[PDB]
Amino acid sequence: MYFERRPDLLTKGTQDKAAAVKLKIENFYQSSVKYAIERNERRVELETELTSHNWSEERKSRQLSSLGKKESQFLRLRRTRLSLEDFHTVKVIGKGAFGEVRLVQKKDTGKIYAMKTLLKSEMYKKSDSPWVVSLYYSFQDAQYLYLIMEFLPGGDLMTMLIRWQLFTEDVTRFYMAECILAIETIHKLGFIHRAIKPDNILIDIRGHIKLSDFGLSTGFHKTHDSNYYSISLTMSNRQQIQTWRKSRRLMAYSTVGTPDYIAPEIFLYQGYGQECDWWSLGAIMYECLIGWPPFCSETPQETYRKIMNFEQTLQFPDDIHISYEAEDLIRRLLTHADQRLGRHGGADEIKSHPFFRGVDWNTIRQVEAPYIPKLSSITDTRFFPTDELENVPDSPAMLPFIGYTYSRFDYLTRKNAL
């Protein structure tokens, strides 16, 4: 039947549904081969080591069964599909603009995970280190996107800074040094976080600090500018404890991503570098020592203006509390990018400032932290502003989605904790 063929009247729901199948089948068999090819590979890896130690035949056929014990569980995994109702919600924890964050127990077993809820079609964009929150796996549905992370009961640094309103130079030295070491590590993996800020900073069971993210898919960008162009009633330290209070009671949820802690050269063109995140550190350091961030303003545009003319907008109040090495550090972190501390082969050029003489930077993780969260269970939301606002103008109103066809390697690591 030496024949031929042509398009014309396959109604574009069965035209491009063939472009999909061709893609599906190639990636399929390409991978069915890879899978089997490593299935084989690691099997013969253990069998070259069971006869590399002169072991008993009872022993090898326990190790060998332990191997396939694993192997079987893997294929059991990919077969798994889950959604909600495989999770039970405990309490709501936070809200960004895109979606909230949830303390979750998995009905299936029952653990403490962190659920981050997000929104496809609204985020356009069209590993394993002590210092950053652990992401395990993720699964999708029709409208939102779901991520599974360990839950940090320490609250956030924003929520800390409220409860204490002011850190000492010793509290702060600790928490700063912690941030350096988190930030250092992120940079060493060739990333810039570009979203360092109080609420983006998290506390574990032992009062220690870790980052939560890396600055890929958190949020938005800045409008690059805009233009607007009487009896006083104020006492001016109160003046911020007044404005700030409006930047959480009506801005934590449905946030904007406040420009404090945003270094200057970002509002300019794309011209920035790893140094970008050290500014925000100095921003932060300032905040906990003084009582607000350096450029805190009535409105965020005003804040833009200050950062841009920062050389005359940075001033330390007359509430003394700040040594000659504290004040120096913030200043050498809150300057021009190519000049800033931690720019020149830095990130430990910071550690050598005389505001530390710090711990060996080794034992730092083993040390009594200024506040160990006093916890009452494994589901203690006590450290969270568990008040509820719940206004997300998405409202689309009224076991799908196989969560993984992963690789073996991620199966081990995620099994070695889950």
Binding site: T168, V171, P370
Partner: peptide, 5 residues
């Protein structure tokens, strides 16, 4: 209280 040198 706390002290971190």
């Amino acid at each position: 209280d706390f002290k971190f040198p």
